Amino acid sequence: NEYAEQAVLGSILTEPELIKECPLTPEHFSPGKHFNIYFTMQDLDRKGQSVDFTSIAARVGEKLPQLGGFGYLTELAASVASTTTFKQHCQTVSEYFQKRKAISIAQQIIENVNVKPIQEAVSELMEIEASGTDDDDGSIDEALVTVYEEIESADGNITGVPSGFTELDRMTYGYKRRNFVLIAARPSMGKTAFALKQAKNMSDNDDVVNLHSLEMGKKENIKRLIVTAGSINAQKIKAARRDFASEDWGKLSMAIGEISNSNINIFDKAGQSVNYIWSKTRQTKRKNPGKRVIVMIDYLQLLEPAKANDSRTNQISQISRDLKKMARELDVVVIALSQLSRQVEQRQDKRPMLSDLRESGQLEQDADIIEFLYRDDYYDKESESKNIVEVIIAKHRDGPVGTVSLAFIKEYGNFVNLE
């Protein structure tokens, strides 16, 4: 391959310091030109100098035409649009080098064989391994310095996207960018209101929240965001409102402003594939530069799978795995509400654990911050924790676990901080 071979040579003549960031030998390059363009290029490096046209042409003064002349070195440096592809090209050159020697050691065996062909399979073995030159080595001695800076310069203040709960962010330091958090819980625990809360809290820290409600409508999601924002009574508005509530219009004509002054985006298409959400995530991330994006999903199970004719347990796996990829490759916080096995209610301790994620197998594995919700005053009419939802972080990949308590105001769908 000559095309990728030029790029490497050129990008080096452009950045005379890249000969280090990628180790090669003239053996990799084509005969004559490219070969000599590196041989002389590499020599000036081992002698502890720089590598540019001027220097190279200054080295082989009489034997310059053997490198395609000076008119070629400049053409090589001209061909390189941007030295960003260097890695990618320096690898294409490398793959083709293995390929060259792989055959050279292959047709080597044939000629070698025809005492005993044992020492052959041994000599032809040592060569086939040394020809395996890769690009990702392990150096804990280098990437350590990269961390140190960050340890030193410690921004004592939530790094990622804040949840809006002081006692929770003091563990996560903001849901990161590649993370895939899971908000699962039994029905009637605030599973939805807890989401719509974090939804706004993020929209207040000036982030973008994409709420995918496959269960509810674009309206109810707002109708809830209002009754939660202005602290107005949920039952009042519904129907009474007009001739039943007064002086609340102040808290209403305020909330209606807040929601319209927020970065909340709501999608309510009935059937949403992980790929659908993907597309709507790029689009939102494109229209909104510089700012972080969070993708909420109101029901992991109501999502539309990729393979219609497949086992249910495999569909949730297909979804889960895909959902994670999105967060990673698109670099956005992915929050997915889920449901827990109906089997939770047939125990003495109604407190959810990981095994309660029924069908979903590849679920708990792809999740970064599995957090269950638990209202004690649902299973017990006489609880010592009146109106207290306890958010249980059962899994944290880059952090600790534990239970966080919050006050749930059933009437406003609001959550309050404690301790």
Add this chain to the structure above:
Amino acid sequence: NEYAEQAVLGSILTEPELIKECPLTPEHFSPGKHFNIYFTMQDLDRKGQSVDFTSIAARVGEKLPQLGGFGYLTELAASVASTTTFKQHCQTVSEYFQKRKAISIAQQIIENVNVKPIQEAVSELMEIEIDEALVTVYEEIESADGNITGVPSGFTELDRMTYGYKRRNFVLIAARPSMGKTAFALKQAKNMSDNDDVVNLHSLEMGKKENIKRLIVTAGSINAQKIKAARRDFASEDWGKLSMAIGEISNSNINIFDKAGQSVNYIWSKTRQTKRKNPGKRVIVMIDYLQLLEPAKANDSRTNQISQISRDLKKMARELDVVVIALSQLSRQVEQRQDKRPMLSDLRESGQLEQDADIIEFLYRDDYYDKESESKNIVEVIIAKHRDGPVGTVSLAFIKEYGNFVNLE
């Protein structure tokens, strides 16, 4: 269109980060060049790399000429004045893509239609297919009425909680056998047809006849046992209540489907059809047995079938915008307790059930388990789940003889 097609290919070769900002497949582009220009262009992206002349030409080293040669990639990159109209051009390319397939799926029908051409027009159909939205929200609350917004149940004490089953809701009327599970449905059936709404009754258990035979004995208040056989030479002056009920049922908007095996998709089709023939008016879809519905995957676990049904049933209500009422049955395990009063956990197999339901309402006749009940002839409808409302128990008087329900308090 090749002109806008160049702009797209070019502006991408200019900004090797725009292949992402606008999704396409080689299928969109003209054959040969433009095609291969994207095929190879897209491939390098999926492999997690960059897309520029240098890289593209480095990929297909021998087969470079099939992309118009290197001299063409540069001409494309030069053709782009500014990468600002990339959106406008990436749309002109997309518009022409639909137009290409719209014909490819149109002349598809022609050759296809050429068993029954029914599944054709169906298969050829599926292929052929915030601040802004909050100002109305204001007027919604302002347009508070004080009465029933959605579809009324017909029970004053119940509608004072739901304000009419909404449009996207999926309510569940579950209960043990012999509680009025069916008669309670056939009651709401008419009450909705009186409020001038359309009720699609899917009785998979009974016949198109018995459903009417019950609607009459309930409408005219005539005795259920009389008519059956005696009627002719056993009842008198009831012909007035009969020649009145027979009219009511024929003057109603009740539609009864009684095909033996009904898939959720079957009901779906019969719902669009009824909604199309009847414009402007709301439609309610009743199902006399959630378990007698035919699943999608025959060879699957039973607990997954009820989930396949339930999940599908909800989507229908949401995407078709109609009230979906599904009668169900409760685990036989209810009768082995002291309090025969049903709860959510009693929904046996069905797991993804209670989660997709909006208004789970169980029925309970106390005078079935107790011969000496203080509530003689009293069914108590128990709303155990209300997503956009409150819970609680509502009491109604059940007239066993007429299959009629009466209001109280």
